């Protein structure tokens, strides 16, 4: 198999969601994960992930720890290879201008990435974590939160999040 059928389907979905499918990007991510995973136990420690982030993205230690906490939903103290691949695809050279629109497209559900609580509601902490991961002004984030809070309860629904994402994508396309 071409590195399992599920990863092939994920790569096909990424190609159907991106203009450029690159060359052996998933293979490069798997090689980097294998280099990071010393024990080859399909998992990596927080120190190895922090070192990889500092060597590749040169991120801060607190931001790397927050990203590791958000990605590792199992809370077992380790980051899986699939989680590392998902995080690497989420980054996707975020310094590029088109990477902002790619993150606006996000993923197939594009709701649970920001929603760390998982109760179909994004709080202020989730928005702060998103602003830490993706660079955005605090005033702009507050204006976006005010625009998304139609009811005023400081809660974002899945349908409301999809509508906001569609509006942002339509505005960026034109």
């Amino acid at each position: 198999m071409k590195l399992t059928p599920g990863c092939f389907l994920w790569y096909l979905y990424m190609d159907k969601i991106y203009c450029l499918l690159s060359l052996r990007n998933v293979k490069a991510l798997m090689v980097y994960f294998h280099l990071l995973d010393v024990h080859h136990r399909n998992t990596l420690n927080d120190v190895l992930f922090f070192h990889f982030l500092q060597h590749v993205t040169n991120l801060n230690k607190s931001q790397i720890g927050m990203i590791f906490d958000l990605l590792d939903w199992t809370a077992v103290g380790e980051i899986g290879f699939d989680q590392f691949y998902v995080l690497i695809c989420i980054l996707l050279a975020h310094q590029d201008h088109l990477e902002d629109h790619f993150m606006y497209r996000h993923s197939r559900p594009v709701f649970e990435l920001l929603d760390l609580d998982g109760e179909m509601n994004i709080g202020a902490a989730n928005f702060q974590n998103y602003r830490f991961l993706f660079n955005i002004k605090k005033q702009e984030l507050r204006d976006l939160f005010h625009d998304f809070d139609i009811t005023g309860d400081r809660l974002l629904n899945y349908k409301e999040f999809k509508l906001y994402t569609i509006f942002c994508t339509d505005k960026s396309i034109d």
Binding site: Y32, R41, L48, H55, V56
Partner: protein, 149 residues
């Protein structure tokens, strides 16, 4: 020592349909002419970039792929990445032409296998979460992996 087959790295990998061997021969001839004329490295790089752009700068009526390649080569980062990818592949093909396989490749493979085994033994067993030797070994392994990648 790329240790790759000549029929694999010179199998017309370019999507434009141009032959890799002819482009490699043209690059070698240009490099020989520049070395005879004692050209600077920056001038040699500019000449190689111009030759690679002219390779994709064929008749635009014969397919829009050439036009797309010429547009991509007009940028800075994308053109530099494409030139870096073409130069390593051309160098690997040139090395594999005469005779690439030789010793010390098995030594490198044995070193990589020993490093992987030592890293697995270090990461599998960790009696001390606040120890200094195991953490230093893990940091050295991470740095070596970052440098290799």
């Amino acid at each position: 020592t790329a240790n790759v087959s000549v029929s694999d790295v010179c199998e017309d990998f370019d999507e434009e349909g141009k032959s890799v061997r002819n482009r490699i021969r043209k690059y070698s001839q240009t490099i020989s002419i520049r070395d005879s004329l004692n050209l600077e490295p920056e001038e040699i790089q500019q000449q190689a970039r111009r030759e690679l752009e002219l390779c994709h700068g064929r008749s635009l009526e014969h397919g829009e792929d050439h036009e797309e390649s010429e547009t991509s080569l007009a940028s800075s980062t994308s053109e530099s990445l494409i030139f870096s990818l073409w130069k390593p592949h051309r160098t690997y093909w040139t090395e594999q032409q005469n005779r690439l396989p030789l010793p010390l490749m098995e030594l490198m493979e044995t070193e990589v296998l020993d490093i992987l085994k030592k890293a697995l033994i270090t990461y599998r067993s960790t009696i001390g979460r606040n120890h200094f030797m195991t953490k230093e070994l893990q940091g050295y392994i991470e740095g070596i992996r970052k440098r290799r990648n």
